[PDB]
Amino acid sequence: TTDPVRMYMREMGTVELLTREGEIDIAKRIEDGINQVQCSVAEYPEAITYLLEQYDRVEAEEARLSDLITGFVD
């Protein structure tokens, strides 16, 4: 009917509400996905040496710890 409120309201109404169990399913899939790329990044040599070149610049007072890492586990 145009009036975009309606063609929105009607477009989302198709998507089914998640079951309380379905919520955890999707979140688990997310973890795997990111974790695939996290491990995939760890396997790149340039990814390490680059991290090295960034911290060697931090200790020389050419940068700050806040512009490189957000902290580790801990």
Binding site: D3, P4, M7, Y8, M12, V15
Partner: protein, 1166 residues
């Protein structure tokens, strides 16, 4: 040589679709942020709708940051925040742009009633919209698979359809789809297919739509427009000062609605950009895209979707389409219509002292009006050191300034204007005369042309600044230069009420009066007798007079005699110039004769003598009327002595018919009608009773017993002279007044038996109220109704101007007296006067040429035609004129405020329409709408039917709802048979031969028929005789020329039949068409020429088609005109009136007609 690159005097204008690269050309920056102003320092936030960087400095020649504040640094872009320091004017000019995230549809080309994207793609609108909102997928460049190019699919259908064929099939949705469709479209190819399809199938339904589409397409192709551009990539932003944020008092701010709108479009757009880098789900980016689509629509044209409302304010915010648009068409030139400097206005008073060429101008108005003139003259003569000191002198009203003002005034006309400007005489130039007091004084003689009373009407003054305007004001619009109405050549300067009562009292005679019988040497000692108290003003007297007749060849003859006349007439003869005979003043001199006096004076001695004469008549009229002591007392209105008896006798009749209705001898209706008539007869009886008693009753004695003359009673003199009052109105004062009418339209069968000299009682008065109340409304609505008519009229003519000199067509219309049923409802001399003969006219015998071929017919020639018995003269009209794009003066006629034949370039269209419109206030099927019905071509409800073709006719087939009529021509093929509903009573004789155009039934006939069957000259005559009936029944004089020029525009268009250049059925200009088949008849093709058929368009329909699109955007619906031209890329060449005014140049008529001509030839010329 080199043509140019920088600024010249531009000609024409072009309108077209805008490329993204083209929009970017205008843009001085991308407005990237909804921010307006800083909120503390009220400075513009940078990269926002108001940005000094993008648009321009807030203040003159000053950088925003303030680093370069000096008027010296100018083209410098500040290194800190880029602002080139320049006048703030550039904030009114520089545009901007916005690069849109998703493509967007242009509401104008999507939603204008003939959807441009829709018929350019031959795709339904609802489908295109379903694609824009993501409600279905549409195919593009479908290839060979399963699917049509424009076919539409659903989610599941697209998926199933996608699984089968991965490639060689393509489908999209949203704006990108429509844009892909338009870009992919090959226009050339569609025409070929469309041309073939046109030829194969013959059906009106089919090829009607076909021709519409093909016209747009080949138009769009030749246009230069690329279809893709109807979908917006880049969105221009309007310069800030055209939607300013300016502050107000008390510190509140106020700004244009575009800002609330523009901001939204920016925001949604910006969020959408963001939602892509956040990779939002489909359901969202679609919704943001839909939302962006809505905002662009509200910005551009609001009201075509949801009608967005302004922030915190209920009223829907006004959009860009609404800024151009309005009621009606454009706000700029439309009534009304721009305020103008060097003007004023005030209440007006009399000023009988004025000569006919001048006016009383308040001292103070003139000081403020001519202020720059006064300043420069003050320091031109050195009375003021500098312009500032000059300001202080006149601001002080120093005594010396008044004399300088008389200098700047002396030869310097001013324009006077009244409120409902109807004909061109609504503005007239006068020479100003300095007057103490706050009132404008207006020459009485002009008060008539303006329709200006002294009951407080106010008038406006305008100063003609430029030299060309002073000589225009003096030589065109000047009072003395227009003394004659352009509607009919009769003088509009006619003496008015008081003045004509004076001359009536002056030339008049009673039976016995002082000096009766004596004789005097000349008018001089007649006045010496009167002023000295010896002789009465009116007494029968012989006096020696010397009259003149110019009957030589341009030479004044003299003849002197003893004329038997009165004292008053002898004195008045003193005013009459030269070659007029004494005969003109020897009559009783009423208002009618007193106008024909002026008329003849104009047609014999010319302009100058008529002017100085006209003045004189006024002065003398007022003066002698003042001596006369005419008044109106209550004993001046005389009721007949037999009145009580007439009412009583007529009242018996009513009680008789009543006895017949109670006894059933007569029906209720038959009774009612009877009573209404007997009462009616009584009104006539009483009225023609008081009129006889009132009229002649001065009954006096000379040396003998008795004699009786026309009464000298005051109120009678008023009505006989023509000053004021009329037999109808006098009748209401003394005799009974009328039978009023109840609101529903019935007429009360109990008239008002009393009058105003007597009392009207509660009932009589209460009943009179309805007539008064309806009276006022009718004039007030019919005043407005008339104006609408003149509007439609000047629109259909306007650009019509005398262009050629003599077109040289022998063609013309036959002029006969109107001769309706009685004797001669209008003579021949008036119909033929001032026209030009189509061919030489004979005496009753021949090899005798009275009038030779085309000769202007003036008064001597018309008397020469009247001398001979000549009853019919063929005359050239503007309706038959062969000149294309105008009227040749020779075909027009002479008429003007001047007697000469119309000059080259005068705009007749305006003066035709205005002349038809101005009297329309005075009108009353029939009435003023009947006139509108005529000019609108409207076909009556139950029209008659005319024989389609000559030959013997008969009836065929049977009663289906139509009983067929079969015509059988002698030589030719029979096949014409028309289906006529048989429940309408016929006329055409079943056994008789009927000529084409005969009456096959009765009832009115559509002028469409008359043009088609009977021909052009015939139909033009029908209109003129019909509209002229309405006006003439009311006493309105309008020369047929004006009705004819309007008519010419009515038939301006025609519909082609044959072919060989342009399309079959196209409706088009006989100007264009006639130029194309006349060019082909020679040169070109040996003869390939196409035949047309002339069409009759109502005035309002014909004005719709206008070559100039700027003209159409004024009075038509602005949105539609602009789209339809921008698609076709129409190039407006100016050349018309309306458009040149819009753009602000010399009208291509009148003084300007010389200019445009001089340029037009430079154009399309080496």
């Amino acid at each position: 040589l080199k043509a140019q690159t920088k600024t010249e005097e531009f000609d024409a204008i072009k309108i077209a679709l805008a490329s993204p690269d083209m929009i970017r050309s205008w843009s001085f920056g991308e407005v990237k942020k909804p921010e307006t102003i800083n909120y503390r320092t009220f400075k513009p936030e940078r990269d926002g709708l108001f940005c000094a960087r993008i648009f321009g400095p807030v203040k003159d020649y000053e950088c925003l940051c303030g680093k370069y504040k000096r008027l010296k640094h100018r083209g410098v872009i500040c290194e800190k925040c880029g602002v080139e320091v320049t006048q703030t004017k550039v904030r009114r000019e520089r545009m901007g742009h916005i690069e849109l995230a998703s493509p967007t549809a242009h509401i104008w080309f999507l939603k204008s009633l003939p959807s441009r994207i829709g018929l350019l793609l031959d795709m339904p609108l609802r489908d295109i919209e379903r694609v824009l909102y993501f409600e279905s997928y549409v195919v593009i460049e479908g290839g060979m698979t399963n699917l049509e190019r424009q076919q539409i699919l659903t989610e599941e259908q697209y998926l199933d359809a996608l699984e089968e064929f991965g490639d060689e099939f393509d489908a999209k949705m949203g704006a990108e789809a429509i844009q892909a469709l338009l870009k992919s479209m090959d226009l050339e190819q569609e025409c070929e297919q469309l041309r073939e399809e046109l030829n194969e199938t013959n059906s009106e339904t089919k090829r009607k739509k076909l021709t519409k589409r093909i016209k747009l397409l080949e138009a769009f192709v030749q246009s230069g427009n690329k279809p893709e551009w109807m979908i917006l990539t880049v969105l221009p932003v309007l310069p800030p000062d055209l939607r300013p944020l300016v502050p107000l008092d008390g510190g509140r701010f106020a700004t244009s609605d575009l800002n609330d709108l523009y901001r939204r479009v920016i925001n949604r757009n910006n969020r959408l950009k963001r939602l892509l880098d956040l990779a939002a789900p489909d359901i969202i980016v679609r919704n943001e895209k839909r939302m962006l689509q809505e905002a662009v629509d509200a910005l551009l044209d609001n009201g075509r979707r949801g009608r967005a409302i302004t922030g915190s304010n209920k009223r829907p915010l006004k959009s860009l389409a609404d800024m151009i648009k309005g009621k009606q068409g454009r706000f700029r030139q439309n009534l009304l219509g721009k305020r103008v400097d060097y003007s004023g206005r005030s209440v007006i008073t009399v000023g009988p002292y004025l000569r006919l060429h001048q006016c009383g101008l308040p001292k103070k108005m003139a000081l403020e009006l001519f202020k720059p003139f006064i300043y420069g003259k003050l320091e031109l003569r050195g009375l003021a050191t500098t312009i500032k000191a000059a300001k202080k002198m006149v601001e002080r009203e120093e005594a010396v300034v008044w004399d300088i003002l008389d200098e700047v005034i002396r030869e310097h006309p001013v324009l006077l204007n009244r409120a409902p400007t109807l004909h061109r005489l609504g503005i007239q130039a006068f020479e100003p005369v300095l007057i103490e007091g706050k009132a404008i004084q207006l020459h009485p003689l002009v008060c008539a042309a303006y329709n200006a009373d002294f009951d407080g009407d106010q008038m406006a003054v305008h100063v003609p600044l430029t030299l060309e305007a002073q000589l225009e004001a003096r030589a065109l619009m000047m009072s003395t230069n227009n003394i004659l109405s352009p509607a009919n050549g009769e003088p509009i300067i006619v003496p008015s009420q008081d003045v004509v009562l004076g001359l009536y009292y002056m030339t008049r005679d009673c039976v016995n009066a002082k000096g009766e019988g004596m004789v005097l040497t000349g008018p001089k000692e007649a006045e010496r007798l009167y002023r000295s108290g010896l002789a009465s003003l009116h007494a029968r007297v012989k006096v020696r007079i010397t009259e003149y007749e110019k009957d030589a060849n341009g030479e004044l003859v003299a003849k002197t005699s003893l004329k038997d006349t009165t004292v008053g007439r002898a004195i008045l003869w003193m005013i009459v110039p030269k070659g007029l005979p004494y005969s003109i003043v020897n009559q009783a001199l009423g208002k009618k004769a007193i106008s024909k006096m002026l008329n003849t004076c104009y047609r014999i001695l010319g302009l100058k003598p008529t002017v100085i004469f006209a003045d004189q008549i006024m002065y003398t009229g007022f003066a002698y009327a003042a001596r006369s002591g005419a008044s109106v007392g209550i004993d001046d209105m005389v009721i007949p002595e037999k009145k009580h008896e007439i009412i009583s006798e007529a009242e018996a009749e009513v009680a008789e018919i009543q006895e017949q209705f109670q006894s059933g001898l007569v029906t209720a209706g038959e009774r009612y009608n009877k009573v209404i008539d007997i009462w009616a007869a009584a009104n006539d009886r009483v009225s023609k009773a008081m009129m006889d008693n009132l009229q002649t009753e001065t009954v006096i004695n000379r040396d003998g017993q008795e004699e009786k003359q026309v009464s000298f009673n005051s109120i009678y003199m008023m009505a006989d002279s023509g000053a004021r009052g009329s037999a109808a109105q006098i009748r209401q004062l003394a005799g009974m007044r009328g039978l009023m009418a109840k609101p529903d339209g019935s007429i009360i069968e109990t008239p008002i038996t009393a009058n105003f000299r007597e009392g009207l009682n509660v009932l009589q008065y209460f009943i009179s109220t309805h007539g008064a109340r309806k009276g006022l409304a009718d004039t007030a609505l019919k005043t407005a109704n008339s104006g609408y008519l003149t509007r439609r009229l000047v629109d259909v003519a306007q650009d019509l101007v005398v262009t050629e000199d003599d077109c040289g067509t022998h063609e013309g219309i036959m002029m006969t007296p109107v001769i309706e049923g009685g004797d001669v409802k209008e003579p021949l001399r008036d119909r033929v006067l001032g026209r030009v003969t189509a061919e030489d006219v004979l005496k009753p015998g021949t090899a005798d040429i009275l009038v030779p071929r085309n000769t202007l017919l003036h008064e001597q020639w018309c008397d020469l035609l009247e001398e001979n018995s000549v009853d019919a003269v063929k005359v050239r009209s503007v309706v038959s004129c062969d000149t294309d794009f105008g009227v040749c003066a020779h075909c027009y006629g002479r008429d003007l405020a001047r007697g000469h034949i119309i000059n080259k370039g005068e705009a007749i269209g305006v003066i035709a329409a205005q002349s038809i419109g101005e009297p329309g206030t005075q009108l009353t099927t029939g009435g003023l709408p009947r006139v509108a019905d005529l000019f609108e071509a409207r076909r009556p409800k139950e029209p008659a039917i005319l024989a389609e073709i000559s030959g013997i006719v008969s009836f065929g087939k049977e009663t289906k709802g139509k009983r067929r009529l079969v015509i059988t021509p002698v030589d030719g093929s029979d096949p014409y048979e028309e289906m006529i509903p048989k429940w309408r009573q016929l006329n055409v004789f079943e056994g008789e031969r009927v000529e084409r155009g005969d009456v096959i039934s009765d009832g009115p006939e559509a002028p469409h028929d008359i043009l088609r069957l009977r021909g052009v000259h015939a139909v033009t005559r029908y209109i003129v005789n019909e509209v002229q009936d309405v006006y003439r029944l009311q006493g309105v004089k309008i020369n047929d020329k004006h009705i004819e020029v309007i008519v010419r525009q009515m038939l301006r268009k025609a519909t082609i039949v044959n072919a060989g250049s342009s399309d079959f059925l196209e409706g088009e200009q006989v100007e264009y068409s006639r130029v194309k088949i006349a060019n082909r008849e020679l040169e070109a093709n040996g003869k390939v020429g196409a035949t047309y058929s002339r069409d009759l368009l109502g005035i309002t329909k014909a004005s719709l088609a206008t070559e100039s699109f700027i003209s159409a955007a004024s009075f038509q619906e602005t949105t539609r005109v602009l789209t339809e031209a921008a698609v076709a890329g129409k190039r407006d060449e100016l050349r018309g009136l309306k458009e040149n005014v819009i753009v602000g140049r010399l009208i291509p008529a009148g003084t300007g007609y010389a200019y445009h001509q001089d340029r037009m030839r430079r154009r399309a010329a080496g």
